[PDB]
Design a protein around this nucleic acid. Structure first.
Ligand SMILES: [Zn+2]
Ligand SMILES: [Zn+2]
Lengths: 197, 197
DNA sequence: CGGGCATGCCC
DNA sequence: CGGGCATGCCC
């Protein structure tokens, strides 16, 4: 078992928050976000855009880290890993990592030598002029249902904004359900919330 | 892809056939056999008794081999293997083999150097006096549904009676569905046969 | 594309 | 134990 990183929202002195794109209505849309549930529903190994918004400009050398943790108390201490099947199936990501970043030449994949937890880090880049946010494309390389991996257990993705010195500048999180039919599953979960939540 | 061993029934000069035990009615009975479907429904890593019946006594040194093949034409050439998850989960069986034999001190596990197919072999032993058959206890170490293994594809188990020289004395086969609820699944499949087969 | 099934497992 | 759900995928 491994010590558990904080998932406590900390928007901090830079006013850090996440944003997500609206999606179509398809049963099998590739990625769709539920504001009511703060939960992303997406397909495995498909683009998941996450926007970074800040009110104040982070210092040069700021980094953006993503890490998965199991949401439920009883699974929090277990490291989130790729299942053995998909592990055995891009040149930089270790096969065991669940979360990848696409289209970034400065991506780093880390394995914590104490907690054994995986994370993926890219440099923070400010928005282009006239733009309000910066977008990172994440991929999740297993379904939430994968036998021997997540095994139908919900996870959070924790996004931390960190300075080059390691100071925590901001932290936000969202739940993720990686699945074959993100539209179906989002709509059922939202209905279940309203009907019996 | 690998060449495909025969599944053609050959009861042969010794009158070789298989027998199976009757089971209870439970939804999750450990092992149950459908004569109408020539199909065993069983749970993973649980005892599956198979009886060997002969009309004439096989010669000394006769062996009994079990091997799995995919039943459907489109999958026949693929070697049946343990899924990566269960492979990574008795002292003699290689982790990759689907079929094991329990309670036999002369069991051999083989990996064919040409076809790459797995088989498990035990000596043939004649029934005790007053007994009509000899029983072997097999185990299947994945569910039929296992991602990265059988993946919901049906298999046959082929049992061959072979002399010590390698001559084929007899061959029989039965379909297998390894699953959580053998009673449920047998009853549904038998109903489907009657209703729309 | 959206309807619908099989199947491990609910806690 | 038997009812029933979530979820990958039907070919
Ligand atoms: Zn997986
Ligand atoms: Zn398996």
């Amino acid at each position: 078992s491994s010590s558990v990183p904080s998932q406590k929202t900390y928007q901090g002195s830079y006013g850090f928050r996440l944003g997500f794109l609206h999606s179509g209505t398809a049963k099998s849309v590739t990625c769709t976000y539920s504001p009511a549930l703060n939960k992303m529903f997406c397909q495995l190994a498909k683009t998941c855009p996450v926007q970074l918004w800040v009110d104040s400009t982070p210092p040069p050398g700021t980094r953006v880290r993503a890490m998965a943790i199991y949401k439920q108390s009883q699974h929090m201490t277990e490291v989130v890993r790729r299942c053995p099947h998909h592990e055995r199936c891009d040149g930089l990501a270790p096969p065991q990592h669940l979360i990848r970043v696409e289209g970034n030449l400065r991506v780093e994949y880390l394995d914590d030598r104490n907690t054994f937890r995986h994370s993926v880090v890219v440099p923070y880049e400010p928005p282009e002029v006239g733009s309000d946010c910066t977008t990172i494309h994440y991929n999740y390389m297993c379904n939430s249902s994968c036998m021997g991996g997540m095994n139908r257990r919900p996870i959070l993705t924790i996004i931390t904004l960190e300075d080059s010195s390691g100071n925590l500048l901001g932290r936000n999180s969202f739940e993720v359900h990686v699945c074959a039919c993100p539209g179906r599953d989002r709509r059922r979960e939202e209905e279940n919330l309203r009907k019996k939540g």
